[PDB]
Design a protein around this ligand. Structure first.
Ligand SMILES: CC(C)C[C@H](N)C(=O)NS(=O)(=O)OC[C@H]1O[C@@H](n2cnc3c(N)ncnc32)[C@H](O)[C@@H]1O
Ligand SMILES: CC(C)C[C@H](N)C(=O)O
Length: 1004
């Protein structure tokens, strides 16, 4: 239980030595006279500053910590910088929950954990310090220094000096941002206009992906909205807007179908509003509908619902309606008991002919009289209205809905699953196949005339556009967002000649699997304009309409260029207030200066900055770009990373090269197979993990988390079997330096040594491939779990004791396979082996030629040892083992025949049917067609397990002799007395006939 502490200690001292010799500070002025193999540059999406760093953070970024640990050995020079996001809508939303909690309940509060106060005392804060966190700017004081201490404490390979904060509190970053956005307005990628977006009324601004708590992908979804005029007489409750004209307002998606209205659906129990539009009319719907319309300019005042009256639907029942389009000049409001209150307007269009719900429920009101009677509806309001043909889908004729409803045997509006199957297999056809019937459009496929039917209804004033968030959107601040129609500066991602270009960048980008790339391709063709113009929350100010601020997904996109110069500008002061190393004033970074630094061919600008500094920066940036690698969750694919090509494409539109190169999406970290939830008692800040399991102890489990795009897992129990094998290895290397002698002076020629060194070399290679494929689970598997396999194997098979020079080799090479993973343990180990330098300077271990047939021989060996420890738990002293020289007769036939079926079609043995068929057809297998089809099966098994080598008429290595090279170990672990190995020709009938090479038999 104190072995964990054995790890923590050497960590703290190794970290001390590291940043006092400043091992991780790289400069590009130094490393441009010496091209290693090039540069290596990785970034992590700088995280939000509304908290310590949690674990899911650390697993998403482990990925680049290991990339550079590895690529530094491989010899590249590493730049791993770290920025800190605050330009958020997160930091302020939190500060405001805390503000309104202090002011509702006191300091110390008193409530009727789950309140933000209780989360802030969960960080050990005195009372009067949690109070100072109410305006957002105490966060920018507090959390960034904590991220930098939490990162140096995990031991990451990071140039402090290039780090920074992101709101206008940091001047330099702000000047950078303004430069970007001047160039963007300049090149016609930022526009202004009245557009649609998701929008939070409490926020007073657009609510885009990173400002949300729910529905991070949703956007505006359109509807047609129909006006139904209520006709005199009004029902008993519409009485006092004696003046105005009164409208039922209903949401639909199939405007072409509106010819077949027979009525109108409301739910007797639902709460409906009536309110005064902009032109003095009374619209009737749900409060949520109205609020959505208000923000889209339906109301006199934006977002204010002038509520004229309130009521359940039950009072509306029986109102007469003039409806658009339908040749029923008078229809009625009827009760549909099952209306979802979320989507739409609480009023639905009854097209019995093409919605199944509708023909169902209309049947129901016709069917039994008490369904009318309870809602007091007259019969003239229901019975005289039969369904109506408008779409003729080919499969089904005029009346598609009622047709497919009578064949699924429907009887009420609640058979909801049968109904929904119907709506699938009718609606989707209706779009493509369907063909219109009504005059004018007599016979066009609806896919075409849908839009123009709709326009026709708008201009005769009968219908209006209505938007709605698709699935619901929560905001950070907890206000249920709506679409709004508003003034906005925005990014023009729907342009043709920009989407073209960035999707080219996508083709050239490297995603590490096919699915991550289909996500990019998905959102590219989906992405249109993106509203970046905000008005509340921390950040940076739009330099020409300064009431606007830049939202977080839009000032985040090309930030990595700055990462290359921060150390020469802020020098590492996070707020950049400390003077600049280069001496350059923030007030001196005008566009033309940035322009110079970044665009290769810009002109030196009329600036007071001596030419040498500007060259230092231009140089640095040009050395480190492009971005070699960005790492992240599967979540930033549909927003930040799409916007990240798009922007790089538009910034250096010319340099194909300055674009990003590669991008690797892991999933969301789980905890012990559990959604990692602060409420479920199932959670771990990094500050916390690093003291529970050592930082090496942690990183180890974080390699084994996952490399699927699919959500990876973190199991604490395995973090512990990890601290285990680490302390046994360190005690093991203590053990080997203490016994330099009871190892073997002289030549390492024994059979097992060749085997073990050819194995250690195959491990160095598999680990190299797994590191460069960035599969840190398998890089672990090969590089360590099996390195220890092959070490213990040669611990056991070497009865002669193990060879000194080979031991210290394995020590070094293991320790180097591990450095990217646990650099503190390895640093300790490497100074144990007394080497003079820091292990960060080591070259990747070189691999020696790999003896294949050897390793097959030792595999064969090990396998029959397993087999014979099995057959032994039964009943002895003597053993005798038999091994057949040639395959027996029936088997050299069945395997000269699987040789012929393998040789004739590039390796595809036909099915079980062609094989057993042509083996019953050879007479020499008649007594043995009971043993001729298990055998081929076992063959196909290993023909799928260790190569086609099992199809040779003769092995690659003397069986009998390989046996004989290791027999001592066998009698000693098997604890017998003597074992004969006869060549299976002197054995009995059963043994000489059922024994094949590769699977010997034996007796006691
Ligand atoms: C650049 C700007 C637009 C973004 C801003 N800096 C920001 O998003 N900060 S953050 O706090 O949510 O993102 C930090 C990183 O960590 C990854 N990640 C997050 N959660 C998890 C998780 N549960 N499991 C695994 N990985 C996670 C995530 O992909 C992201 O790259
Ligand atoms: C009854 C419905 C099919 C009417 C409209 N097309 C909708 O989907 O809401």
């Amino acid at each position: 239980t104190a072995k964990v502490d054995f790890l923590k200690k050497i960590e703290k001292e190794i970290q001390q030595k590291w940043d006092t010799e400043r091992v991780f500070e790289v400069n590009a002025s130094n490393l441009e006279k010496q091209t290693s193999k090039g540069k290596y540059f990785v970034t992590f999406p700088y995280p939000y500053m509304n908290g310590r760093l949690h674990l899911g953070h650390t697993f998403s970024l482990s990925k680049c910590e290991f990339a550079v640990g590895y690529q530094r050995l491989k010899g590249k020079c590493c730049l791993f910088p770290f920025g800190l996001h605050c330009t958020g809508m997160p930091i302020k939303a939190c500060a405001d929950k805390l503000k309104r909690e202090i002011e509702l309940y006191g300091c110390p509060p008193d409530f009727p954990s789950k309140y933000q106060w209780g989360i802030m005392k969960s960080l050990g804060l005195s009372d009067e310090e949690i109070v100072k966190f109410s305006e957002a700017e105490h966060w920018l004081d507090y959390f960034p220094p904590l991220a930098i201490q939490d990162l140096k404490r995990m031991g990451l390979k990071v140039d402090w000096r290039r780090s920074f904060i992101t709101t206008d509190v940091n001047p330099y970053y702000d000047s950078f941002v303004r430069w970007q956005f001047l160039t963007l307005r300049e090149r016609n990628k930022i526009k202004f206009g009245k557009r649609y977006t998701i929008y939070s009324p409490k926020d007073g601004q657009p609510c885009m992906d990173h400002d949300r708590q729910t529905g991070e992908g949703v956007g505006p979804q359109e509807y047609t909205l129909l006006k139904l005029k209520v006709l005199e007489p009004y029902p008993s409750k519409l009485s006092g807007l004696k003046g105005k004209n009164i409208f039922l307002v209903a949401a639909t998606l199939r405007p072409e179908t509106m010819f077949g209205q027979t009525n109108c659906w409301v739910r007797p129990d639902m709460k409906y509003i009536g309110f005064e539009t902009v032109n003095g009319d009374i619209f009737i719907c749900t409060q949520k509908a109205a609020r959505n319309m208000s923000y889209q300019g339906f109301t006199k005042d934006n977002g204010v619902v002038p509520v004229v009256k309130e009521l359940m639907g039950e009072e509306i029942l029986g109102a007469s309606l003039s409806a658009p389009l339908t040749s029923y000049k008078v229809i009625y409001v009827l009760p549909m008991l099952t209306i979802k209150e979320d989507k739409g307007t609480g009023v639905v269009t009854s097209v019995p002919s093409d919605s199944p719900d509708d023909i169902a429920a209309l049947r129901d009101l016709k069917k039994k009289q008490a369904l009318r009677a309870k809602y007091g509806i007259r019969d003239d309001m229901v019975l005289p209205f039969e369904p109506v043909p408008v779409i003729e889908i080919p499969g089904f004729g005029n009346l598609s809905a009622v047709t497919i409803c009578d064949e699924l045997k429907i009887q009420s509006q609640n058979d909801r699953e049968k109904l929904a199957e119907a709506k699938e297999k009718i609606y989707l056809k209706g779009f493509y196949e369907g063909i219109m019937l009504v005059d004018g459009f007599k016979g066009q496929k609806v896919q075409d005339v849908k839009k123009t039917i709709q326009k026709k209804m708008i201009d005769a004033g009968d219908a209006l556009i209505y938007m709605e968030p698709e699935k619901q959107v929560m905001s950070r601040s907890s206000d249920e967002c709506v679409v709004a129609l508003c003034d906005q500066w925005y990014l023009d991602y729907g342009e043709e000649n920009w989407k073209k270009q960035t999707s080219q960048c996508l083709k050239n980008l490297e995603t590490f699997c096919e699915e991550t790339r289909r996500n990019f391709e998905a959102t590219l063709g989906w992405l249109q304009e993106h509203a970046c113009s905000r008005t509340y929350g921390l950040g940076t100010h739009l330099p020409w309409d300064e009431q606007w601020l830049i939202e977080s997904l839009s000032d985040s996109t090309i930030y990595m260029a700055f990462y290359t110069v921060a150390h020469l500008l802020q020098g590492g002061n996070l707020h950049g207030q400390a003077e600049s190393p280069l001496g350059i004033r923030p007030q001196q970074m005008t566009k033309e200066v940035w322009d110079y630094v970044f665009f290769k061919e810009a002109p030196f600008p009329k600036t007071q900055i001596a030419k040498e500094k500007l060259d230092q920066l231009k140089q640095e940036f040009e050395f480190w770009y492009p971005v070699d690698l960005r790492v992240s969750g599967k979540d930033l694919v549909p927003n930040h990373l799409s916007y990240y090509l798009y922007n790089h494409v538009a910034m250096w539109p010319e340099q194909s090269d300055k674009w990003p190169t590669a991008v690797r999406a892991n999933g969301h970290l789980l905890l012990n197979s559990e959604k990692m939830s602060k409420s479920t008692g199932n959670f771990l800040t990094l500050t916390q993990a690093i003291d529970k399991f050592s930082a090496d102890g942690m990183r180890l489990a974080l390699a084994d988390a996952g490399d699927t795009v699919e959500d990876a897992n973190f199991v604490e129990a395995m973090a512990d079997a990890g601290i285990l094998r680490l302390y046994t290895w360190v005690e093991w290397v203590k053990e080997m330096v203490a016994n330099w002698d009871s190892l073997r002076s002289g030549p390492a020629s024994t059979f097992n040594d060749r085997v073990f060194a050819s194995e250690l070399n195959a491990g160095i290679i598999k680990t190299d491939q797994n590191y460069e494929k960035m599969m840190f689970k398998e890089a672990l598997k090969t590089g360590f779990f099996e390195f220890q396999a092959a070490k213990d194997k040669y611990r056991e098979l070497a009865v002669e004791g193990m060879h000194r020079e080979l031991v210290f080799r394995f020590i070094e090479v293991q320790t180097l396979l591990l450095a990217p993973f646990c650099p503190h343990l390895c640093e300790h180990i490497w100074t144990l082996l007394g080497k003079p330098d820091s292990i960060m300077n080591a070259s990747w271990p070189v691999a020696g030629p790999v003896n294949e047939v050897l390793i097959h021989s030792s595999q064969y060996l090990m396998e029959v040892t397993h087999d014979l420890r099995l057959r032994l738990k039964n009943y002895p002293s003597h053993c005798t083992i038999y091994v057949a020289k040639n395959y027996p007769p029936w088997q050299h036939t069945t395997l000269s025949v699987l040789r012929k079926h393998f040789e004739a079609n590039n390796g595809k043995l036909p099915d079980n049917k062609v094989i057993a068929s042509e083996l019953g057809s050879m007479p020499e297998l008649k007594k043995y067609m009971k043993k001729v089809m298990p055998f081929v099966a076992m063959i196909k098994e290993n023909l799928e397990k260790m190569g086609p080598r099992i199809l040779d008429l003769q092995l690659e290595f003397d069986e009998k002799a390989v046996l004989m090279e290791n027999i001592v170990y066998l009698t000693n672990s098997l604890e017998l007395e003597h074992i004969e190995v006869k060549f299976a020709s002197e054995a009995e009938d059963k043994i000489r006939e059922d024994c094949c090479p590769g699977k010997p038999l034996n007796v006691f």
